[PDB]
Design an enzyme around this catalytic site. Structure first.
Site, PDB file in Angstrom:
ATOM      1  N   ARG A  38       0.810  -1.206   0.000  1.00  0.00           N
ATOM      2  CA  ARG A  38       0.000   0.000   0.000  1.00  0.00           C
ATOM      3  C   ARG A  38       0.850   1.265   0.000  1.00  0.00           C
ATOM      4  NH1 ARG A  38      -3.989   2.815   4.307  1.00  0.00           N
ATOM      5  NH2 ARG A  38      -5.456   3.747   2.802  1.00  0.00           N
ATOM      6  N   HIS A  42       0.457   4.378  -2.615  1.00  0.00           N
ATOM      7  CA  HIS A  42       0.303   5.771  -2.228  1.00  0.00           C
ATOM      8  C   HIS A  42       1.502   6.635  -2.599  1.00  0.00           C
ATOM      9  CE1 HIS A  42      -3.263   5.507   0.826  1.00  0.00           C
ATOM     10  NE2 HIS A  42      -3.562   5.030  -0.369  1.00  0.00           N
ATOM     11  N   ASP A  43       2.642   6.012  -2.879  1.00  0.00           N
ATOM     12  CA  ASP A  43       3.800   6.791  -3.293  1.00  0.00           C
ATOM     13  C   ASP A  43       3.580   7.153  -4.755  1.00  0.00           C
ATOM     14  OD1 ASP A  43       6.212   7.987  -3.821  1.00  0.00           O
ATOM     15  OD2 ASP A  43       7.353   6.115  -3.963  1.00  0.00           O
ATOM     16  N   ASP A  50       8.348   8.323  -6.291  1.00  0.00           N
ATOM     17  CA  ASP A  50       9.554   9.095  -6.004  1.00  0.00           C
ATOM     18  C   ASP A  50       9.897   9.129  -4.518  1.00  0.00           C
ATOM     19  OD1 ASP A  50       7.419  10.527  -5.059  1.00  0.00           O
ATOM     20  OD2 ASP A  50       7.905  12.396  -6.105  1.00  0.00           O
ATOM     21  N   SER A  52       8.241  10.217  -2.228  1.00  0.00           N
ATOM     22  CA  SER A  52       7.809  11.463  -1.604  1.00  0.00           C
ATOM     23  C   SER A  52       7.032  11.193  -0.319  1.00  0.00           C
ATOM     24  CB  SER A  52       6.958  12.297  -2.575  1.00  0.00           C
ATOM     25  OG  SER A  52       5.740  11.652  -2.919  1.00  0.00           O
ATOM     26  N   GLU A  64       3.243  13.979   3.599  1.00  0.00           N
ATOM     27  CA  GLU A  64       2.074  13.340   3.007  1.00  0.00           C
ATOM     28  C   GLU A  64       1.460  12.385   4.026  1.00  0.00           C
ATOM     29  OE1 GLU A  64       3.051  11.484  -0.781  1.00  0.00           O
ATOM     30  OE2 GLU A  64       4.285  13.223  -1.294  1.00  0.00           O
ATOM     31  N   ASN A  70      -3.628   8.824   4.274  1.00  0.00           N
ATOM     32  CA  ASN A  70      -2.477   8.253   4.969  1.00  0.00           C
ATOM     33  C   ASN A  70      -2.539   8.324   6.490  1.00  0.00           C
ATOM     34  OD1 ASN A  70      -0.854   7.393   2.731  1.00  0.00           O
ATOM     35  ND2 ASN A  70      -0.314   9.536   2.349  1.00  0.00           N
ATOM     36  N   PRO A 139      -7.409   7.976  -3.980  1.00  0.00           N
ATOM     37  CA  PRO A 139      -8.838   7.667  -4.028  1.00  0.00           C
ATOM     38  C   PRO A 139      -9.363   7.318  -2.645  1.00  0.00           C
ATOM     39  CG  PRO A 139      -7.613   5.776  -4.736  1.00  0.00           C
ATOM     40  CD  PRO A 139      -6.618   6.926  -4.648  1.00  0.00           C
ATOM     41  N   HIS A 170      -6.404  -5.696  -2.483  1.00  0.00           N
ATOM     42  CA  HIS A 170      -7.272  -5.912  -1.333  1.00  0.00           C
ATOM     43  C   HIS A 170      -7.567  -7.392  -1.107  1.00  0.00           C
ATOM     44  CE1 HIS A 170      -8.840  -1.480  -1.632  1.00  0.00           C
ATOM     45  NE2 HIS A 170      -7.617  -1.567  -1.140  1.00  0.00           N
ATOM     46  N   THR A 225      -9.297 -15.508   2.178  1.00  0.00           N
ATOM     47  CA  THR A 225      -7.903 -15.696   2.584  1.00  0.00           C
ATOM     48  C   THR A 225      -7.330 -14.331   2.960  1.00  0.00           C
ATOM     49  OG1 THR A 225      -7.137 -15.554   0.265  1.00  0.00           O
ATOM     50  CG2 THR A 225      -7.539 -17.748   1.185  1.00  0.00           C
ATOM     51  N   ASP A 230      -3.935 -13.774  -3.441  1.00  0.00           N
ATOM     52  CA  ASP A 230      -4.521 -14.654  -4.443  1.00  0.00           C
ATOM     53  C   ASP A 230      -5.713 -13.973  -5.105  1.00  0.00           C
ATOM     54  OD1 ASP A 230      -6.338 -14.649  -2.386  1.00  0.00           O
ATOM     55  OD2 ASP A 230      -5.965 -16.729  -1.781  1.00  0.00           O
TER      56      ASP A 230
HETATM   57  C1  HEM Z   1      -9.010   1.621  -6.187  1.00  0.00           C
HETATM   58  C2  HEM Z   1      -9.008   2.513  -5.041  1.00  0.00           C
HETATM   59  C3  HEM Z   1      -8.590   2.190  -3.751  1.00  0.00           C
HETATM   60  C4  HEM Z   1      -9.204   2.618  -2.623  1.00  0.00           C
HETATM   61  C5  HEM Z   1     -10.423   3.530  -2.544  1.00  0.00           C
HETATM   62  C6  HEM Z   1      -8.513   2.052  -1.499  1.00  0.00           C
HETATM   63  C7  HEM Z   1      -8.875   2.220  -0.165  1.00  0.00           C
HETATM   64  C8  HEM Z   1      -8.280   1.610   0.946  1.00  0.00           C
HETATM   65  C9  HEM Z   1      -8.745   1.754   2.307  1.00  0.00           C
HETATM   66  C10 HEM Z   1      -9.965   2.539   2.793  1.00  0.00           C
HETATM   67  C11 HEM Z   1      -7.941   0.984   3.077  1.00  0.00           C
HETATM   68  C12 HEM Z   1      -8.102   0.807   4.587  1.00  0.00           C
HETATM   69  C13 HEM Z   1      -7.143   1.721   5.328  1.00  0.00           C
HETATM   70  C14 HEM Z   1      -7.315   1.670   6.835  1.00  0.00           C
HETATM   71  O1  HEM Z   1      -8.346   1.158   7.311  1.00  0.00           O
HETATM   72  O2  HEM Z   1      -6.415   2.155   7.546  1.00  0.00           O
HETATM   73  C15 HEM Z   1      -6.972   0.360   2.189  1.00  0.00           C
HETATM   74  C16 HEM Z   1      -6.026  -0.591   2.563  1.00  0.00           C
HETATM   75  C17 HEM Z   1      -5.181  -1.296   1.709  1.00  0.00           C
HETATM   76  N1  HEM Z   1      -5.109  -1.058   0.344  1.00  0.00           N
HETATM   77 FE1  HEM Z   1      -6.330   0.043  -0.797  1.00  0.00          FE
HETATM   78  N2  HEM Z   1      -7.464   1.266  -1.917  1.00  0.00           N
HETATM   79  C18 HEM Z   1      -7.468   1.378  -3.302  1.00  0.00           C
HETATM   80  C19 HEM Z   1      -6.502   0.787  -4.117  1.00  0.00           C
HETATM   81  C20 HEM Z   1      -5.430  -0.001  -3.726  1.00  0.00           C
HETATM   82  C21 HEM Z   1      -4.329  -0.422  -4.582  1.00  0.00           C
HETATM   83  C22 HEM Z   1      -4.136   0.022  -6.029  1.00  0.00           C
HETATM   84  C23 HEM Z   1      -3.479  -1.156  -3.794  1.00  0.00           C
HETATM   85  C24 HEM Z   1      -2.252  -1.758  -4.121  1.00  0.00           C
HETATM   86  C25 HEM Z   1      -1.890  -2.328  -5.392  1.00  0.00           C
HETATM   87  C26 HEM Z   1      -4.069  -1.156  -2.472  1.00  0.00           C
HETATM   88  C27 HEM Z   1      -3.617  -1.902  -1.394  1.00  0.00           C
HETATM   89  C28 HEM Z   1      -4.120  -1.906  -0.102  1.00  0.00           C
HETATM   90  C29 HEM Z   1      -3.665  -2.770   0.955  1.00  0.00           C
HETATM   91  C30 HEM Z   1      -2.699  -3.934   0.777  1.00  0.00           C
HETATM   92  C31 HEM Z   1      -4.296  -2.384   2.097  1.00  0.00           C
HETATM   93  C32 HEM Z   1      -4.073  -2.953   3.495  1.00  0.00           C
HETATM   94  C33 HEM Z   1      -2.948  -2.197   4.180  1.00  0.00           C
HETATM   95  C34 HEM Z   1      -2.720  -2.631   5.615  1.00  0.00           C
HETATM   96  O3  HEM Z   1      -3.431  -3.538   6.097  1.00  0.00           O
HETATM   97  O4  HEM Z   1      -1.823  -2.052   6.261  1.00  0.00           O
HETATM   98  N3  HEM Z   1      -5.214  -0.395  -2.417  1.00  0.00           N
HETATM   99  N4  HEM Z   1      -7.211   0.729   0.871  1.00  0.00           N
HETATM  100 CA   LIG Z   2       5.171   9.959  -4.603  1.00  0.00          CA
HETATM  101 CA   LIG Z   3      -6.578 -13.293  -0.274  1.00  0.00          CA
END
Ligand code: HEM
Ligand SMILES: [Ca+2]
Ligand SMILES: [Ca+2]
Length: 306
Positions: A38, A42-43, A50, A52, A64, A70, A139, A170, A225, A230
């Site tokens: 993640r 976000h970077d 970069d 940042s 940031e 974040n 987003p 996710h 899972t 997966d």
């Molecule tokens: C498409 C729009 C996306 C939205 C709106 C979004 C939103 C979120 C939100 C709300 C969380 C929960 C944060 C929290 O409760 O602290 C999260 C966690 C996460 N997101 Fe996304 N996300 C998006 C795309 C992505 C992408 C592109 C990736 C990576 C390729 C990603 C990977 C993750 C991961 C792995 C977590 C868990 C992080 C952790 O448990 O520390 N997300 N995301």
């Molecule tokens: Ca950046």
């Molecule tokens: Ca899984």
């Protein structure tokens, strides 16, 4: 041009040092792989990949880390510091924080059971952080599908495959109750739950996130899972079991004519998903990088070299 062999001569052991750091951390924190992936996302969505996002506050620019997407959410920064120190010891002033984080993301995916590939390298580190840009570009879970598409296109990812495949991130990780309270009790000011959320799963989520309860409580993104990388994330969507609004919209939005077939294709084949994920990951990793002599090879990822 970025290339996977960038450090094959200057620091051939960088990938292994990064992997070792994550393997070690995973023993005490099983969530770190997801957290690191993640951080890379976000970077990249803010001025490109970069590093940042790794910068801390200065009197001239805000970090940031205090962005809405974040703050009290992004994590794993000390782990990145650890691998950076280890890499600096093995190869002084060679590997940029931007590249380090990209490798860390890929290794995290692989360690969690995902695909294995060599990411393009050669990125350099930013000379400043962009808080306002992060608030504008990251987003949010409450975005509609058109808004999600807009957010990805805004940073350079035009393809629906980019959005559907990267959302696969996710397939593991945690999410705070705060982000689904509307879906559970009052969606879009209807006083009713989000109709696209499976009613049996709705009950389960309401039990984990009761009204007026702990909004910071954590729930798994993937009920099948929780910690394995997966394609189960997509099987969930097909059953209306996506956790956040932005997840389920890929399959249920009125604007999902183009994303539904992608969701199905990824749910039907691990190979198809993994291939698409690597393709999309490398595209995201190619967003406006600083290269050549632009930017620096930051020594401490938290501060610009002086
Ligand atoms: C498409 C729009 C996306 C939205 C709106 C979004 C939103 C979120 C939100 C709300 C969380 C929960 C944060 C929290 O409760 O602290 C999260 C966690 C996460 N997101 Fe996304 N996300 C998006 C795309 C992505 C992408 C592109 C990736 C990576 C390729 C990603 C990977 C993750 C991961 C792995 C977590 C868990 C992080 C952790 O448990 O520390 N997300 N995301
Ligand atoms: Ca950046
Ligand atoms: Ca899984």
């Amino acid at each position: 041009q970025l290339t996977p062999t960038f450090y094959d001569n200057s620091c051939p052991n960088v990938s292994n040092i990064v992997r070792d750091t994550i393997v070690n951390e995973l023993r005490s924190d099983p969530r770190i792989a997801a957290s690191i992936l993640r951080l890379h996302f976000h970077d990249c969505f803010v001025n490109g990949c970069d590093a940042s996002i790794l910068l801390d506050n200065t009197t001239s620019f805000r970090t940031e880390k205090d962005a809405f997407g974040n703050a009290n959410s992004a994590r794993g920064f000390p782990v990145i510091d650890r691998m950076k120190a280890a890499v600096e010891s093995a190869c002084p002033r060679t590997v940029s924080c931007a590249d380090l984080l990209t490798i860390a993301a890929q290794q995290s995916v692989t360690l969690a059971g995902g695909p294995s590939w060599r990411v393009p390298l050669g990125r350099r580190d930013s000379l400043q952080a962009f808080l306002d840009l992060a608030n504008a570009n990251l987003p949010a879970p409450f975005f509609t599908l058109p808004q999600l598409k807009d957010s990805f296109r805004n940073v350079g990812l035009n393809r629906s495959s980019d959005l559907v495949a990267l959302s696969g991130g996710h397939t593991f990780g945690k999410n705070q109750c705060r982000f689904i309270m509307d879906r559970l009790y009052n969606f879009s000011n209807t006083g009713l739950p989000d109709p696209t959320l499976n009613t049996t799963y709705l009950q389960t989520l309401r039990g984990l996130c009761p009204l007026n309860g702990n909004l910071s409580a954590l729930v798994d993104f993937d009920l099948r899972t929780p910690t394995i990388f997966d394609n189960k994330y997509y099987v969930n969507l097909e059953e209306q079991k996506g956790l956040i609004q932005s997840d389920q919209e890929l399959f249920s939005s009125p604007n999902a004519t183009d994303t539904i077939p992608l969701v199905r294709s990824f749910a039907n084949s691990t190979q198809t998903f993994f291939n698409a994920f690597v393709e999309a990951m490398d595209r995201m990793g190619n967003i406006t990088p600083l290269t050549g002599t632009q930017g620096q090879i930051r020594l401490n990822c938290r501060v610009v070299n002086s």
